Amino acid sequence: QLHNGLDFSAKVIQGSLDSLPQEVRKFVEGNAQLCQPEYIHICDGSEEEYGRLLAHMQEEGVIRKLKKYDNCWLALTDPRDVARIDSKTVIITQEQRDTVPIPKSGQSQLGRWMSEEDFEKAFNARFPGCMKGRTMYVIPFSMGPLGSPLAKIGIELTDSPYVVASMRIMTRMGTSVLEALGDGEFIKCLHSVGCPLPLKKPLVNNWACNPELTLIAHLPDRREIISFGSGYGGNSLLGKKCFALRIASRLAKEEGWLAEHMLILGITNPEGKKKYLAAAFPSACGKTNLAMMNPTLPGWKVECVGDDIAWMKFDAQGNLRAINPENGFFGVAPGTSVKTNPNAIKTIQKNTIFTNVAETSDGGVYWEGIDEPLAPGVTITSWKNKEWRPQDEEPCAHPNSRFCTPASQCPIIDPAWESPEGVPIEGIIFGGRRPAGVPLVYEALSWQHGVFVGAAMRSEAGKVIMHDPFAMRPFFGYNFGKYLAHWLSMAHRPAAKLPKIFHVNWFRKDKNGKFLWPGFGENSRVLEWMFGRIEGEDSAKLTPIGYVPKEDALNLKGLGDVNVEELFGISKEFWEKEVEEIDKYLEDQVNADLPYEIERELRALKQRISQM
C-alpha cells in the first residue's frame, strides 16, 4: 500500500488476518474494503465466544433469555422478514438455460435466473458501505463432519450476531475449520442485513433488515453466495439452503454425487437388522417428524442422522453413502408436540434458539399445536410482543417460526451421524400433501420409474395442488432437466446398488375432510413394509402406479378402525387427470431438456392407467 486503507489488521478484534490462509484473507479484506465494517471478528467457535455474543445480543434487546430452560433464547423479528423468500432468490449464470430449462409456453417455476450484468448492478446498489458501524464476523464452517471426504468448507462474512450464533448450531464452525481448510477451496458466503449505521430507516423489533432490497444470489461458477437485506433462516444462514442445496447440487452434478432436500434415518427391526433411509418431502410435509420418529411398533427403533439435507455419493463398492452436512435442526416450531414429535420436545429444552414463537410468563415457549395446557395464571406474549389469549384470532407464533437446536442433543441421534464415510442408503422416499387419489404408500417399478415419481411430486400449498419435484422446486442449483438426467445416469454407474424408491402420502382425506391415516409414530408401520420390501419379501401387489402392500401385509394391530380400501384406492378417473397434469407440467417446464426416459415413464403410466 501507498497509504493505510487496504490492510484491515488494526480493526481486528478477534483472531489475526496473518493467521488466515491467503485466499481467506483476500476474501475477508476485499469485502471489508467494500462493506466498511468498524471491526472484524474472526470466529473461533468457542463456548466463551458464544456465551459472550448471546449476552451482547441480550444487552442490545436483540434476543431474550428463556428462563424456564437451560441456555435457551428467543428472537422476535420484523414481521417483514419472517421466511426464506423465493421471489428474491436468484442464480447467476452466463446462460439462462444452465440454471432453468427454457419453458415451452410459460414462466419457469424451477428457478429464477439473473444475468451477470443485472446482478452487478444490484450488488453495487447494495453492498458498498453496508456494514458501516457494525462488526463483520468471519464464520469458518464445515458442511459435514470435519475430515469427511464428502464435507465441504465455507467462509461466511456477516454483520449479524444472530447469524453467528445460529451458524454455530447449524454448522461446525471455528478455528479447527480454518486449520482443516489450509490452502484448499471454500465457498465464499457474503451476508449483510443491509442497515449501515447511522440507520437510515426505523429499526423494527430490534431486528435489522432491508426488505425492499432483499436479494439472495448464488454464483455457482464463482463459488459465491451473496445475500443482502434479510436476517432470517435460509436467507442468512448460508450453509443450509444456499450452500448445501443450491451451490452443492451444482457441485454434485459436476462431481458425480447428489445434494438433496432429504432427511436421513436409521431404522432397526426386531431381528436386529438396521437400514438407512432418505426422504424428500416439501416444507410443511413432515420430514422432521419422520426423521425423529418415535415408532409405535414394538421392537422397532428409529435414529436420526439428519432432518433436512442429505449429501449422497456412490462409493467404489456401489453403496450410496449419505452424510448429513448440517450440525443441528432448524425445525418448524408450530405443530411440534409430545404426540407429533416427542424427540424434538426433548432436544429443544437446552442450548436452543427460538425465533418468532410465543413466550409464557414463566419464561417458556408456546405455539399453535403445542397441545400442552398451561397452569392457571401463566400468560402468553405473542411473537409480535403483545399479550395474547387462546381465543384470539391471530396465532401466538408465526406459522414459519423455528427452533435452532444442536443435533448432538437429540436423544435418538444415530451413532453414525458424524461418521465421515456416511451411511448406506437402501431406500429413498418421496411424498407430499395429497388429500385425494394418492395411496398411503407405493413402490416404484424401476430406478427410471422412481426418478419419474420424484419428478411428478405434487403437494397441496381455496386449495391449490402445486408441483414440487423431488421437494427441490425452491432449491435446484441448475437446470432441472439436467438434474433428472443426472439422477437417471446413476443406473449406469458400474456396481451401483440403487436404492428402492417409494412414494408416501400421510395426508389423504375422506369425504368429510378427515385424515384416513393417523400418521406420526404410526408411520413406523409403513417403514416396516418398506424394510421388508428392501429385503425381498413377497409383500407387494402390482397396480398401475407401482407396487402397493398386499391385503394384510401392513401391520394394522392397535389401529383397527382404518379404512384401507379408501386409503389405498386407485381411481382410473383421478389418475387419468393426474397424468395429464404431469404431462402438461413436464412439457412446459422441462421442455427440450426432458430426458427420454422420463417421457417414457410418463407414456408407460398413461398406458397402464388406460388398461384399467
Ligand X SMILES: Nc1nc2c(ncn2[C@@H]2O[C@H](COP(=O)(O)OP(=O)(O)OP(=O)(O)O)[C@@H](O)[C@H]2O)c(=O)[nH]1
Q: Which sequence positions are flagged as catalytic?
A: 285
| Contact status: 433 vs ligand SPV (CB under 6 A) | no
What separation in angstroms does the CA of 4 have from each of 33, 63, 130, 132, 222? 11, 37, 21, 18, 29
76 or 100: CB nearest Na ion: 76
3-class DSSP state for residue 87?
helix
Cβ 366 to ligand X, closest distance in Å? 16
Cβ-contact 172, 142 below 8 angstroms: yes
Minimum Å gap between C-beta 205 and Na ion is 4
Q: Is 260 in the site for Mn ion (CB under 5 A)?
A: no
Q: Smaller CB distance to ligand SPV: residue 85 or 444? A: 85
Note whether 455 and 467 are within 8 A (CB). no
Give the cell for residue 280. 424428500
Show the cell assigned to 187. Answer: 465457498
Tell me: does residue 140 bind ligand SPV (CB under 6 A).
no
Closer to ligand SPV at the Cβ: 90 or 181? 90
Residue 513, annotated ligand binder? no
Cα atoms in the 13 Å half-sphere on the side-chain side of 321: 18
Indicate which single residue of 127, 137, 162, 207 sits in contact with Na ion (rule: CB under 5 A): 207
Judge whether 400 is annotated as a binding position.
yes
Stretch 313-342 residues interacting with ligand X (CB under 6 A):
331-332, 335, 340
**Nearest-approach distance from CB 234 to ligand SPV, in angstroms:** 3
Query: How wide is the angle at C-alpha 153 spanned by C-alphas 423 and 22, nearest 5°?
Result: 155
Nine-digit cell string for 501: 424408491
> Cell numbers at residue 425, please?
442408503
CA dihedral sign, ordered 361, 363, 367, 370: negative
Sign of the C-alpha dihedral, residues 603, 605, 608, 612? negative
Between residues 260 and 528, which has the closer beta carbon with respect to ligand SPV?
260
Contact (Cβ atoms closer than 8 angstroms) between residue 360 and residue 379: yes
Cis before 198 (ω within 30): yes
The rounded distance, in Å, linking the Cα atoms of 377 and 200 is 42
Measured CA distances, 493 to 250, 466, 498, 566 (Å): 19, 33, 10, 40
Contact characters 267-296, ligand SPV, x per CB under 6 A: ----------------x-------------
Binding ligand SPV by CB under 6 A: which of 308, 359, 426, 578?
Answer: 308
Paired residues of 153 in beta bridges: 142
Residue type, 409: Q
Residue 94 CB contacts under 8 Å (≥ 6 apart), including other chains: 116, 221
Check residue 205 for interaction with Na ion (CB under 5 A).
Answer: yes
Q: Check binding of 206 to Na ion (CB under 5 A).
A: yes
Residue 256 CB, shortest distance to ligand SPV, in Å, is: 25
* The only residue of 77, 160, 166, 288 in contact with Mn ion, by rule CB under 5 A: 288
Taking contact as CB under 6 A, which single stretch among the options 234-242, 271-279, 526-534, 604-612 is the one that binds ligand SPV?
A: 234-242
Q: Which does 448 bind (CB under 5 to 8 A by kind): Na ion, ligand SPV, ligand X, none?
A: none
Question: Is 601 one of the binding residues for Mn ion (CB under 5 A)?
Answer: no
To the nearest whole angstrom, how small is the minimum distance from the Cβ of residue 265 to Na ion? 35
Kindly give the pairing relationship between strand 500-504 and strand 540-543: unpaired
Nearest distance in Å: CB 61, Na ion: 7
What value does the CA radius of gyration of the chain take, rounded to a whole number of Å? 24
Task: Please select the residue that binds ligand SPV; options are 240, 275, 467, 473, rule is CB under 6 A.
Answer: 240
User: Contact region for ligand X (CB under 6 A) — 217-225, 280-288, 382-390, 457-465?
Assistant: 280-288
Among the listed residues 260, 308, 443, 522, the single contact to Mn ion using CB under 5 A: 308
Q: Is 318 annotated as ligand-binding?
A: no
Residues 6 or more apart whose CB falls under 8 angstroms from that of 187 comprise: 152, 153, 154, 155, 223, 224, 225, 243, 247
The correct pick among 507, 547, 568, 585 for binding ligand X (CB under 6 A) is: 507
> Annotation-wise, does 433 bind a ligand?
yes
User: Side-chain half-sphere of 534: how many Cα atoms within 13 Å?
Assistant: 25
What gap in Å lies between CA 533 and CA 542, rounded to an integer? 13
523 contributes a contact to ligand X by CB under 6 A = yes
For residue 312, the minimal CB distance to Mn ion (Å) is 16
Binding residues for substrate: 84, 232-234, 283, 400-402
State the residues that interact with Mn ion by CB under 5 A: 288, 308, 331
State the residues that interact with Na ion by CB under 5 A: 76, 205-207
State the residues that interact with ligand SPV by CB under 6 A: 84, 233-234, 240-241, 283, 308, 330
Binding residues: 84, 232-234, 241, 261, 283-289, 308, 400-402, 433, 520-523
Binding residues for Mn(2+): 241, 261, 308
